[PDB]
Amino acid sequence: AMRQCAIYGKGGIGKSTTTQNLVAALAEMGKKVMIVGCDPKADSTRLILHSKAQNTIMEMAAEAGTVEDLELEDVLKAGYGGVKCVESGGPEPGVGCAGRGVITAINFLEEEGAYEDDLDFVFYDVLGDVVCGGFAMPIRENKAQEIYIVCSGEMMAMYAANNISKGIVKYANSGSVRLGGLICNSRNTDREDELIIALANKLGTQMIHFVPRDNVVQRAEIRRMTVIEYDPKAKQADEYRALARKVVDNKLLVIPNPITMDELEELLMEFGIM
Template structure:
């Protein structure tokens, strides 16, 4: 079983990337489960065609020990299993704690046993507390960071790399690469390639900005479902193949903030 986690700054397009990747993996005949680890519980929206209304945390609160697999595991596009960890009401409780409770409940119910691939979609401006659970507890071993060429997106990616390095020194977790999600900033691809190099990893994909992504999202679908013949759909398919064959997994070497600022300035941002 391949266990992948996608991290990245909020709003960078991580959930869109995750859902399109899950769709691409499923097209290859793989049994896929996507687990959304964000209190907004919108990770699986494009796969389900709607916001998941039954999160693990909701079910645990409502039914406690009577929670069953059917309460929290939902079937989405092309048979993909979809799970949302959920979170507390805004301003109440710790969202990271929701991830801990959710993953512990999934483990105790043994609902994910025969999947070929599990993809965790994790909120990751900083890797701390409950948000580190997928890598700290070994739920995920291959980490990919979604980033654009914008300074604060790279700042978040660098912080995530620091967390990956910390846990890599204790176990088998490794960084698989940077997934560039374009915002059409100056020299963006070259900057991301150099950033990945400095982190001792690779730019495994550069996803161009395309209006078809927005159209698909407005129709509550992945690009692969909405426009299967589009060039953008093929970008996601190629990324899924590259992830499955990726052997360039590494312990990252994060930069200082001064080094990061200097790098971004060199590329005209």
């Protein structure tokens, strides 16, 4: 078996930094992991690959002719800890549907046998500002059973978490896609941990970890690494190790309870963030 997880959240919230660091910690533990980039920004694997980014399945298929002229061994790339990496890509802005590459990529990976029995985890790093087209496909088509939402005390980040949760509810009659937890990626604001705990409890889930804001992230990423690789002794490395451990041990996977805008505003008012 293998655990199929998707990391969702609003743009810029920390999906790719959190996912790559979490996965590096899993590999450090001895887990075998694949990352599938499902964000048109297409830099979801650069810290594992020590790279600028990674050429996408949509780009590679265009240069080869069709996606069927591609070989899995040509597409998947291994980096830190043996973690395997692939990027979906997407059409250029103004053209088509921004999520269409996600559908092509996941179907290619399934057909070509990328989901080998030896994998322990697959993580999809998915744009979450809209829940439609290929960005909804991991939920609609039962590809990621465990959804973890990166968020913060930012109102927009909590709104996104609620919207993603509504998408999970919409498809709960089929498949087995569930909300596994919220990950708070701190803005260094007071009571932020308490705020995201409260939001998680209203949705029916949990705050699986509070990730501190730490400049070592920038120093590692300038060098194209995870903090796990850049400085294994860093306090922030231990934070990502704690998040990884709690993901491994997590057994709470729920159909969430989306909240009203009034509930969200009351959360913000109560914990004095605003």
